[PDB]
Amino acid sequence: GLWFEEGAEERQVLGPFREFLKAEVAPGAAERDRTGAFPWDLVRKLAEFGVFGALVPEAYGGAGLSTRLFARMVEAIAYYDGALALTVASHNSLATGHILLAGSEAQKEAFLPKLASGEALGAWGLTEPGSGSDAAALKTKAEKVEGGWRLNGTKQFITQGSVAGVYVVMARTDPPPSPERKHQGISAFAFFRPERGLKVGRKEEKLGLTASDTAQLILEDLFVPEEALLGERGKGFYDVLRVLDGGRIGIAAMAVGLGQAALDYALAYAKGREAFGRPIAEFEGVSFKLAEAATELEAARLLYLKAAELKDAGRPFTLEAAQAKLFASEAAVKACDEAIQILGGYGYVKDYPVERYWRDARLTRIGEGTSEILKLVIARRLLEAV
Amino acid sequence: GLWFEEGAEERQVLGPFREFLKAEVAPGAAERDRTGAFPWDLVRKLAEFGVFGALVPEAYGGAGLSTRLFARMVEAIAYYDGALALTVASHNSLATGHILLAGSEAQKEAFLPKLASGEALGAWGLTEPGSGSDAAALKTKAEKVEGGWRLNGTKQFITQGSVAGVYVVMARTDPPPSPERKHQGISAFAFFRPERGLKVGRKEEKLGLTASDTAQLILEDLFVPEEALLGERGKGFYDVLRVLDGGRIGIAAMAVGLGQAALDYALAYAKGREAFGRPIAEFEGVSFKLAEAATELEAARLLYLKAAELKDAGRPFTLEAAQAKLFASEAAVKACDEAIQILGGYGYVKDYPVERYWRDARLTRIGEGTSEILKLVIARRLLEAV
Amino acid sequence: GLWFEEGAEERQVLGPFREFLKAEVAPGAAERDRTGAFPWDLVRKLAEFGVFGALVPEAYGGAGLSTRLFARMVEAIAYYDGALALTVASHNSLATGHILLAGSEAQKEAFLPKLASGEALGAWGLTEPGSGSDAAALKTKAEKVEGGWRLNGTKQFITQGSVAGVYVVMARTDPPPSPERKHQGISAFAFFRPERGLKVGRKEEKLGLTASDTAQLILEDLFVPEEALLGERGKGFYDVLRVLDGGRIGIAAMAVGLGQAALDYALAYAKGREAFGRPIAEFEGVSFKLAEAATELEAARLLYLKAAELKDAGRPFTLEAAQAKLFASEAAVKACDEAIQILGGYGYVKDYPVERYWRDARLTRIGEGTSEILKLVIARRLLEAV
Amino acid sequence: GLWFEEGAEERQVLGPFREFLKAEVAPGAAERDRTGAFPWDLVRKLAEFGVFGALVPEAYGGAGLSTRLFARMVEAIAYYDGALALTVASHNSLATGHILLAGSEAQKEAFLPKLASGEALGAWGLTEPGSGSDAAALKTKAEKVEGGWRLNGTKQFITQGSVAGVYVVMARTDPPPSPERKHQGISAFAFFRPERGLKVGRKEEKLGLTASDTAQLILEDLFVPEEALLGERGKGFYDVLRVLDGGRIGIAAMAVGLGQAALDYALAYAKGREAFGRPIAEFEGVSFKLAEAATELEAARLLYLKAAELKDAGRPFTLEAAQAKLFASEAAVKACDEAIQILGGYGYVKDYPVERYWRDARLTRIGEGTSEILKLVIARRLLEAV
Ligand SMILES: Cc1cc2nc3c(=O)[nH]c(=O)nc-3n(C[C@H](O)[C@H](O)[C@H](O)COP(=O)(O)OP(=O)(O)OC[C@H]3O[C@@H](n4cnc5c(N)ncnc54)[C@H](O)[C@@H]3O)c2cc1C
Ligand SMILES: Cc1cc2nc3c(=O)[nH]c(=O)nc-3n(C[C@H](O)[C@H](O)[C@H](O)COP(=O)(O)OP(=O)(O)OC[C@H]3O[C@@H](n4cnc5c(N)ncnc54)[C@H](O)[C@@H]3O)c2cc1C
Ligand SMILES: Cc1cc2nc3c(=O)[nH]c(=O)nc-3n(C[C@H](O)[C@H](O)[C@H](O)COP(=O)(O)OP(=O)(O)OC[C@H]3O[C@@H](n4cnc5c(N)ncnc54)[C@H](O)[C@@H]3O)c2cc1C
Ligand SMILES: Cc1cc2nc3c(=O)[nH]c(=O)nc-3n(C[C@H](O)[C@H](O)[C@H](O)COP(=O)(O)OP(=O)(O)OC[C@H]3O[C@@H](n4cnc5c(N)ncnc54)[C@H](O)[C@@H]3O)c2cc1C
């Protein structure tokens, strides 16, 4: 069909997928938000579908899907369970994506098959206690030893950090030429869950996405073989930025899914709830919110589809991925907040899903580049183009 | 001192009060947000101070404070514990306020002393499952019987609903002349916790203000004596509106307190957290948020002080109370959301208080008149004045 | 290349078109904004580009272009002269579009060739002094007489009202079945500039779009032949609604053009203007404004391209055209206001074009359905879909 | 009565003042916006009200009014004529205020009587073509010569620049110790309109405030006596900062006046204009805009009254004046834009005053410190307080 809508082939995949989500994922979303229990059962079931190898080429045991279709799949998952959407998006975009992007043929044959089947979930460790937005300020170090490297440092807020079977960690291998250029000298390392040298820190409770595994990683004299070095030594940061460009498309889709769920719930609610003798949807104070949210969410969807298209075409998309994530996350969180408002007192109670949608969506304005950082990324590119 | 700042007499009360809050209330705020355990210990300690009889005249065993001072006290409590602030604000403004406003000398001597000492917490039941914003659409009925009345109906989201010793419930005693004028025929009833006829429904879990008691009340053939009728029969709605005007000043103050706590935390954090070689407070993306929030919160404070002043002067303040609550709640929630953003990933974790500040403040845009309802109230008054 | 980009065919047309605009239209834009002198000379030259018969089939002497290409052409014109863009958009979308939509073969052969060549500009009269948003409340009457009709009424703010050679006027021919169905009974009439019966009222000075011809039309027992009736008698308002859907796509494009011009100017200015030792573009207070505007403008463009595509595909597009116009107009006006701010004092002086961009763009949130009306159109469609 | 209301004394002054404004100023406001003709006649009459020497002590021939009363007077003027309000505010706050602040007894006796009577209007020249927000980067030089100084430089956008009888110009007299301390070495010079050495450049057309005199000043080896030095040599910028604090209070009041005029007009219009069978004020899309604007404008007024009070009390008010100006200007411009929207097409025509209100108010977010600069001033004060 038309570029902006789901084509026949996309519907053939997404239609059945959405029914699976409604039947198997939706029922326990509220409970998972309360308990935080990692959904191993659903991971297993999704993995059997190839969801955890979505972007991985079929040659490596993956589904070989396009960025566009995978993004739509993430939106679909997020509509029913934000935590699961983050689990799926991060696994595919970050750890797996980085190995697919910079891995040698040997590394891709060793890691990709296990990641694509779900046998091994992937964790991507960039952020640290002292550095997030300024990611190049990381302090984890990698020193050269006989047979490989010795890693020492701490990673903060790592998704799948405690359940991962494969880890990709960024560490400094060489001194930076200057503080302005501290990105130089950083390398990436890919390795299977260590027998020793890696421990999970005190788990933090989160505002939302309860069931998503987020943990602190403490690396103490962790040994990794020579084959662990991912990409060229000291040039890992450029690769990190390319990985985040792709990851941002997934987060944009995640945001749209959560915002759409909130809008859909508010629309249905406003049509059935009456006040002053008529459905509240008849008051502009409610209908205008619905119209604005619907419009912004459609705009956000078009933006992430555009970014995905550029990536699928092998063209630069840094600016476009940033714009998509920025707009989708900001619009989605606003839509969720308006949905809470439309339900009134009921929007403040956990028996209804809207308060969870907001709590889950709220992280999309922070993860993989805060909205502030993205505005810098966007402005810089705009100014360069004069 | 100058009208807009705390005078010497106000500081004499608030200064020591704030230290008490820092030492006895602040320490357990996070735990109460997780467990929802009603703070009986703190209620007892505050009650000994007269906090639960703040507006009640000294003749009835109250503290006889001004609306202005009580509002500042609510802001102070909210700064450290939103749930406790709501408990204090609702008890004083609604149940107690309604009895003080419309009670006969006999009723005030019977109820006020117990409410002012905290021996009896007050619950005010207006809202029902089918009516909130359109409060005059309530369905609870009061039928005249020998010796008094028989009440039947359900109240929704009632603060102190399960722990109250005194209840004030609104019910229809006479048929409305028309749907446009359904407010006519509604009466208010004040009574001590019933030996029978009243039961607490399934408790709902909330987005925030966890430790604040919120319950559904089910009235089944509840008998109340003739002396229970509060105000004139069928004219209780006008009184309800006057009670809400006063209550809105307290909620405005509550919002300001929560927003100020968020701003203060973000300011301190931004000064100590460094990125790209400098405190993040040095980046306009952060400092502009701080400046805007500080400015809006000060404006909100001036607005609630103005409303309080008018009430203390015995002058109309419906428009002013609505403006104060509308602006304070909207500004406070925005400030809290910006504080989450400034802390970044840390703003999304429960080890820090900012995510709780937002969750607690979020109800202020809904309770005692949603922002939408308040805009209607304000616009109507503006248009009447031409 | 990709759907959202200009295709090979589009570039071959838009490339030289833009060159013409920069050389012949841009130079006098500022002067026209000051004098309001209608650009008859530019109209003649533009007519050569197919621009005054863009959507009219080649059979009737038009250019036979797609809605998508025409929309891009309107954005291009708007980038350099907002008044000219409105002249082109209205002529094509309203008067011409209505005749193309409901005209009989005889009417199309008689009117379209003259409109499509620019020899006769078209004016569309719907709005009246007492009705705009509530367009079906028009009072202009059309009484049936021997061999035709006699029209009496006043039309307000009609584009091309004083310079038009062809007029399309909506007038009531039959009584409305009920006040709720007042849209029934309205007919459309197409006719050439009469010798009498039509006079132009006191010209009003406008905030922007100075050179765009806007006038009040006073119909005084204006006679029109039987052949003047456009569409089915009493079904004129239905055609009007269809005409507005198409028109809104053009206004959305117009808005994007003006907003893009403001953004581009602000970007160039911020890169060259220094303060405190560096380009002001290096301060986030400035760069964040630029990033947000750019993000919203690109979403707005995607929205109008989507609406144009649906129209070209013969599919429903009422909802989509409303979303495009609403989003684009609101985003463009904000971007223009931000540009004024970025230029500081220079943004307040007419020597620079940004203040004009805002004044011109400001009408896009009002014309062809105010933003408020569009939110209603949007909400209704969303709710009807359940 | 209450602090925030007009006191007995204020009403006795403002009552007749407002009557004068409505009778003598309001009638020609629209015409002056079209012609830009400086209102010399109104200046003479206003001078009678003490308005051109409002803050000047009676000893020096002034009115000896409080900052609070003067601020209310500026709001009153702005309500009817924005250009006149700027003329009064700038004359009083800048040129006159600077001489009153740093002038010696001899300078005050020589300048103030003439400025305070309106016989000599005052121009304050700080801004230059290359420096505005970064005011300390001024390039105008003051070389020491026999019996005085010789000034060379260009001043940009100077209010009263071409009609002033007294000029206060900032020029560098000594080299800056370092680029970071460039504010040191700047001096102020007060002098009467010279016979040569000062010429007015090409007048620029403005977006609004048409009748306000604004001009570029070219100083060409302009000689001024030793007595021209205002304040301590090289310490002129410190006085400049103090002058701006006071000026910002006046601009805040100006903004409130314009915003209030727009709000009042929109309220009256919405009550009388009907659509779809009822006053448009009955649609929340319109009434919510009115309620928000009214709420923000009253907060803005409270903020400027607070700042004025602190100044009158001899207490610090830098932070407060910045907050007042920032809030008032932003709120007023938004209210004016909403008024344009509420009038629909009529809001876009000059026959109605709302488009002028917006154009006039728009400068308040730029003059005497852009909103961006004010947020910096605010943030710095907040952070210094820890
Ligand atoms: C639930 C969750 C899951 C996550 N999963 C992963 C993961 O799987 N892998 C991984 O590596 N990381 C992960 N993260 C970390 C996340 O990427 C970082 O939190 C984020 O990139 C930076 O946030 P921060 O906490 O470092 O805040 P900071 O970087 O300290 O920033 C704090 C505030 O300062 C602002 N700021 C900083 N610099 C500037 C500037 N120059 N201009 C303007 N504003 C600025 C920021 O926008 C923010 O508002 C996760 C975080 C969370 C909460
Ligand atoms: C934690 C909590 C504590 C509370 N405590 C008390 C208490 O102590 N005592 C008590 O009596 N009640 C209490 N309430 C109830 C509260 O007052 C009501 O929820 C509120 O007044 C109305 O909300 P609602 O749930 O009825 O939503 P509704 O009234 O159904 O409204 C839903 C949405 O429609 C909007 N809307 C409705 N009408 C219009 C209109 N005409 N125009 C535009 N928009 C409209 C509302 O603004 C809202 O966005 C409490 C609620 C909560 C959540
Ligand atoms: C420069 C210019 C060119 C124009 N050219 C043409 C033309 O070529 N042909 C033509 O026929 N007309 C033309 N118009 C008129 C334009 O179409 C109308 O102005 C518009 O459709 C309705 O605006 P109005 O002035 O009637 O405002 P109103 O309809 O009176 O509305 C006033 C305010 O009330 C709001 N409002 C009204 N109803 C509701 C509601 N139900 N809910 C919420 N808000 C509501 C509106 O949004 C607006 O904010 C032009 C106008 C201008 C200024
Ligand atoms: C009608 C009018 C009357 C005036 N009257 C007077 C007068 O009487 N006397 C006088 O001396 N001047 C006067 N001015 C000038 C006015 O004071 C200056 O324009 C203003 O102080 C600075 O604006 P600028 O044009 O220099 O913009 P710039 O200083 O170049 O700033 C341009 C943009 O960059 C932003 N910016 C700059 N630095 C930063 C930063 N560090 N962080 C974030 N953003 C930044 C600004 O906010 C603005 O958005 C007047 C101007 C006008 C238009």
Side-chain angles (χ1 to χ4, degrees), chain B residues 44 65 74 86 99 122 146 159 162 169 180 191 229 254 257 272 286 304 326 331 350 356 367 376-377:
Chain B
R44 189 182 314 178
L65 304 181
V74 170
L86 179 59
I99 292 174
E146 179 182 60
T159 306
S162 77
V169 177
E180 283 85 47
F191 53 96
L229 180 63
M254 173 175 167
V286 169
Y304 88 61
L326 172 64
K350 296 188 176 292
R356 183 189 81 233
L376 288 177
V377 170

Side-chain angles (χ1 to χ4, degrees), chain C residues 205-217:
Chain C
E205 296 296 352
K206 304 190 299 299
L207 168 59
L209 303 174
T210 320
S212 182
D213 181 58
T214 309
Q216 187 184 71
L217 305 180

Side-chain angles (χ1 to χ4, degrees), chain A residues 34 38 42 55 63 76 95 130-131 195 213 216 219 241 280-281 294 329 339 372:
Chain A
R34 296 189 294 271
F38 190 78
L42 289 176
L55 301 179
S131 59
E195 285 290 63
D213 181 52
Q216 185 184 72
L219 304 173
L241 295 177
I280 62 181
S329 63
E372 293 64 48

Side-chain angles (χ1 to χ4, degrees), chain A residues 269 273-276 280 283 285-286 289 341-346 348-349, chain B residues 86 90 94 124-128 131-134 156-159 206 209 214 363 366-370 372-373 376, chain D residues 284 288:
Chain A
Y269 189 82
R273 175 69 167 181
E274 294 189 54
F276 303 98
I280 62 181
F283 294 112
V286 169
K289 289 178 179 176
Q341 196 62 23
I342 289 170
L343 267 63
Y346 300 97
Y348 202 71
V349 174
Chain B
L86 179 59
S90 60
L94 311 178
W124 192 72
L126 175 64
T127 295
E128 303 194 354
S131 59
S133 298
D134 182 14
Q156 196 89 302
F157 304 142
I158 307 308
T159 306
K206 307 189 294 289
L209 305 172
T214 308
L363 187 63
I366 299 170
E368 304 199 14
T370 63
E372 293 64 48
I373 287 303
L376 288 177
Chain D
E284 305 188 328
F288 280 21

Side-chain angles (χ1 to χ4, degrees), chain A residues 247-267:
Chain A
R248 286 166 183 170
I249 298 177
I251 299 307
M254 173 175 167
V256 173
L258 286 159
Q260 189 70 53
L263 170 57
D264 286 354
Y265 200 98
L267 279 165

